[PDB]
Amino acid sequence: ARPKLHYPNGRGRMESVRWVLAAAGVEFDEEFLETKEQLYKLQDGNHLLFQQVPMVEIDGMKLVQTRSILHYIADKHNLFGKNLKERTLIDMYVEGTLDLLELLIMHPFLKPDDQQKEVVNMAQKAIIRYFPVFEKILRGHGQSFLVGNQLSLADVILLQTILALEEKIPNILSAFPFLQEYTVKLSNIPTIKRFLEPGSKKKPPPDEIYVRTVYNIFR
Amino acid sequence: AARPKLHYPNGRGRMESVRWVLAAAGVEFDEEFLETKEQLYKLQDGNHLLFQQVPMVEIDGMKLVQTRSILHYIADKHNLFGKNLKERTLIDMYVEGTLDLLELLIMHPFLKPDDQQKEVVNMAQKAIIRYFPVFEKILRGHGQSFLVGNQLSLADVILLQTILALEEKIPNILSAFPFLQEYTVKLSNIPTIKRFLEPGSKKKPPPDEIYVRTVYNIFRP
Ligand SMILES: CCCCC[C@@H](O)[C@H](CCO)SC[C@H](NC(=O)CC[C@H](N)C(=O)O)C(=O)NCC(=O)O
Numbered sequence: 548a549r550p551k552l553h554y555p556n557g558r559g560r561m562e563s564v565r566w567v568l569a570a571a572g573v574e575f576d577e578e579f580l581e582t583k584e585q586l587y588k589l590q591d592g593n594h595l596l597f598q599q600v601p602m603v604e605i606d607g608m609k610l611v612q613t614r615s616i617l618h619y620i621a622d623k624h625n626l627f628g629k630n631l632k633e634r635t636l637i638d639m640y641v642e643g644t645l646d647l648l649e650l651l652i653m654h655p656f657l658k659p660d661d662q663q664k665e666v667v668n669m670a671q672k673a674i675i676r677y678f679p680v681f682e683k684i685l686r687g688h689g690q691s692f693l694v695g696n697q698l699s700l701a702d703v704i705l706l707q708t709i710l711a712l713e714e715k716i717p718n719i720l721s722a723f724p725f726l727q728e729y730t731v732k733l734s735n736i737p738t739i740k741r742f743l744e745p746g747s748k749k750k751p752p753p754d755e756i757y758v759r760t761v762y763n764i765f766r
Numbered sequence: 767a768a769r770p771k772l773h774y775p776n777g778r779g780r781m782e783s784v785r786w787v788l789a790a791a792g793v794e795f796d797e798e799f800l801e802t803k804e805q806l807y808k809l810q811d812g813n814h815l816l817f818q819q820v821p822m823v824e825i826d827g828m829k830l831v832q833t834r835s836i837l838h839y840i841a842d843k844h845n846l847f848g849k850n851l852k853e854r855t856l857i858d859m860y861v862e863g864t865l866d867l868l869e870l871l872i873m874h875p876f877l878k879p880d881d882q883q884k885e886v887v888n889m890a891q892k893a894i895i896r897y898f899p900v901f902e903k904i905l906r907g908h909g910q911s912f913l914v915g916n917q918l919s920l921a922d923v924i925l926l927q928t929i930l931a932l933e934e935k936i937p938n939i940l941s942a943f944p945f946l947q948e949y950t951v952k953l954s955n956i957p958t959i960k961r962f963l964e965p966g967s968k969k970k971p972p973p974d975e976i977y978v979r980t981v982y983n984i985f986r987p
């Protein structure tokens with residue numbers, strides 16, 4: 548076995564799956580979509596449940612839907628808590644955080660005028676809607692993890708999203724010292740630290756070639 | 767309180783999936799309708815909404831938000847998420863895909879009146895190309911009344927919701943999908959579901975002008 552990820556060569560929606568696999572210590576392969584014809588081939592052969600990517604071949608199955616993929620991996624590698632109470636919290640936090648990450652996922656495809664507007668919208672949402680929640684959680688119970696004092700899917704997705712946000716707004720954590728310190732400790736967990744170093748399968752911020760490619764593939 | 771309390775405007779929107787799963791599970795629930803900006807501010811200002819948004823459901827002493835997380839929770843409390851990880855994983859993917867289709871319906875009332883016509887067409891194409899054929903083949907494949915295992919799951923409830931809501935706009939949408947037709951009849955005759963479909967349930971009607979106007983009045987600065 549060994550997971551194989553099907554996506555174009557870039558972050559998009561697949562980046563959360565890369566984060567969670569790397570964080571769990573799971574090495575993986577990628578089969579990159581570069582052309583519209585490669586997508587059609589993948590759709591032609593019944594490999595994509597709903598004709599879309601992300602898709603991951605894992606444990607003899609061909610999983611689709613970003614959130615389902617994440618839930619499966621988390622459950623295989625103790626990243627979804629120890630009971631229903633913790634699972635529920637992790638789930639809500641992840642779903643919330645994915646609504647913020649969505650703004651970064653769509654950013655590359657907005658007109659330039661709207662791209663600037665969207666960075667402002669990102670800043671407002673992070674600072675007013677999301678970060679205070681996680682900041683308060685971390686200030687209140689003091690721990691290095693949001694839930695159950697062990698690494699969970701909520702920590703991994705929050706880290707991805709924070710780090711992605713900081714690329715657009717370098718000082719975004721300045722009013723959030725507990726989140727600053729959280730980000731640093733999380734970033735030192737051996738698997739995460741390696742994922743963040745050169746040579747991992749972590750994808751860079753999207754360049755003009757990725758944007759043209761996705762337009763070419765998905766129109 | 768064991769009686770859930772649902773916070774949302776008086777209408778379907780995103781909350782209707784929650785109403786569907788609760789009714790399907792035989793859970794009586796109460797509703798607290800958001801009718802104005804001021805009521806929303808109160809809910810937000812008081813820290814009752816984790817991320818400042820609805821749907822929010824008070825259940826088993828918790829204030830759950832995020833439609834997907836609310837549905838998962840209810841499904842785990844009422845044996846609608848299968849009996850093992852293989853089933854759970856299938857149910858999860860099916861719900862997630864179905865919700866991408868249901869999204870077209872949720873957002874349809876808020877499009878420009880010229881775009882609405884185009885979006886019914888596009889709604890029809892997505893359903894018939896992308897989703898229905900997957901589910902038709904599953905239901906031909908094991909000849910079982912349910913999508914996963916041999917019992918009602920979250921995936922059946924959300925699929926039924928979605929099929930029925932599509933049929934309101936495209937009445938013949940299932941004509942090339944005989945197994946889906948049969949499945950829709952079976953599910954619609956499960957007593958909890960059959961009661962939900964009857965007048966007097968808390969099932970909400972299609973969105974009207976009162977509803978649309980209200981949501982602009984609540985959620986728009
Ligand atoms: C506007 C131009 C780009 C649009 C595409 C973007 O949405 C994303 C690329 C981001 O870099 S992803 C490609 C898309 N996938 C999904 O939307 C999965 C959603 C599901 N809810 C999930 O989370 O898995 C796709 O596969 N489309 C095949 C097709 O329809 O033929």
Ligand SMILES: CCCCC[C@@H](O)[C@H](CCO)SC[C@H](NC(=O)CC[C@H](N)C(=O)O)C(=O)NCC(=O)O
Binds near residue numbers: 780820833834876982
């Ligand atoms: C088009 C004009 C407004 C449309 C709003 C619609 O999206 C929905 C109403 C459908 O009739 S719902 C109202 C919205 N909720 C969410 O977006 C939750 C999403 C989360 N992913 C979920 O699934 O739970 C909201 O509460 N916004 C508070 C605010 O920001 O002030």
